[PDB]
Design a protein around this ligand. Structure first.
Ligand SMILES: *CCC(=O)Nc1cc(N2CCN(CC)CC2)ccc1Nc1cc(N(C)C(=O)Nc2c(Cl)c(OC)cc(OC)c2Cl)ncn1
Length: 302
């Protein structure tokens, strides 16, 4: 019913101006807001933020889940390439958990919107994107996510749904991993789709999917799907493949084709992330180093 206070994280309710809803998830409700004086050394500055709170179908467990998500984010600490906790309103009112706002949306969308222009044969011939990404920009998205994941892994955090939908992009084009404070924990609805109508099982390592074993190595497999999403500019993995057929593909050792405009080296990295044997996949630390080297050598002229 009523909560302890942590003074270092506490923001007075009068310092938070709630704004338009962003929507309900399984988790809770989120709203855009403006927070005044988040920093001690800057008490007149307004920061745009996102705020999580319970929905009025107020569940019970959901309160302990929202608390747990906040508390985990406190324990993980701050990193440039994750969505960071900025504050909370815990006293004399509903729990509000306040986090960084990433203004350019999720990565899947950010890549889709920057696809090259529509042609005579396209689904969308008048698609004329505002911005375009070079080969270096794409490698650089990959590097930034890997660096975020390396950080999380060093804090003993296993994500368990790494995908472009769960990477967010700031106004400065920084990649931030989202929804890393959660738990699942059971196998949910292997058939439940995402808002965009996709099946999360398509990002899951076979040992997680078949033996419920989730490790840093299973997140590396998901990262390889993410790489494939980046280099297809927000492509959808296994389009038209239902769950039962996906299981069969994995049991046969099937692997996705190399996307066009992907080097053999980046395809090898993908495939190595998709090693059948988890011990043989690269780690996030190695993916960070490799991607750092590749970025430096990748052309920004196309
Ligand atoms: C401040 C962010 C913003 O301005 N908008 C925003 C919009 C979107 N869109 C998705 C759907 N599009 C329709 C086509 C419209 C654009 C996507 C992302 C952002 N930024 C954003 C969103 C969120 N959300 C929704 C959160 O739930 N954030 C959040 C996270 Cl990631 C985590 O991660 C651990 C934890 C909590 O609470 C504990 C929350 Cl609230 N956040 C940030 N930025």
């Amino acid at each position: 019913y009523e909560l302890p206070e942590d003074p270092r994280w506490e923001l007075p309710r009068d310092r938070l101006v709630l704004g338009k809803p962003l929507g309900e998830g399984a988790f809770g409700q989120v709203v855009l807001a403006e927070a005044i004086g988040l920093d001690k050394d800057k008490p007149n500055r307004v920061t745009k933020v996102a705020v999580k709170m319970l929905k009025s179908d107020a569940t019970e467990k959901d309160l302990s889940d929202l608390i747990s998500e906040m508390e985990m984010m406190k324990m993980i600490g701050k990193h440039k390439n994750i969505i960071n906790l900025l504050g909370a309103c815990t006293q004399d009112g509903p729990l509000y958990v306040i986090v960084e706002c990433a203004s350019k949306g999720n990565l899947r969308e950010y890549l889709q919107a920057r696809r090259p222009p529509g042609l005579e044969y396209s689904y969308n011939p008048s698609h004329n994107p505002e911005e375009q990404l070079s080969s270096k920009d794409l490698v650089s998205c990959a590097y930034q996510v890997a660096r975020g994941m390396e950080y999380l892994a060093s804090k003993k955090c296993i994500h368990r749904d790494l995908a472009a939908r769960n990477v967010l992009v700031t106004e400065d084009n920084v990649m931030k991993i989202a929804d890393f404070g959660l738990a699942r924990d059971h196998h949910i609805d292997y058939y439940k789709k995402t808002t965009n109508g996709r099946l999360p099982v398509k990002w899951m390592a076979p040992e997680a999917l078949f033996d419920r074993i989730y490790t840093h190595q299973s997140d590396v497999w998901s990262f390889g799907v993410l790489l494939w999403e980046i280099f297809t500019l927000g492509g959808s993995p296994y389009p038209g493949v239902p769950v039962e057929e996906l299981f069969k593909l994995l049991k046969e050792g099937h692997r996705m084709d190399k996307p066009s405009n992907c080097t053999n080296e980046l395809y090898m990295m993908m495939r190595d992330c998709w090693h059948a044997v988890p011990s043989q996949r690269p780690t996030f630390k190695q993916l960070v180093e490799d991607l750092d080297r590749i970025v430096a050598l990748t052309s920004n002229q196309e």
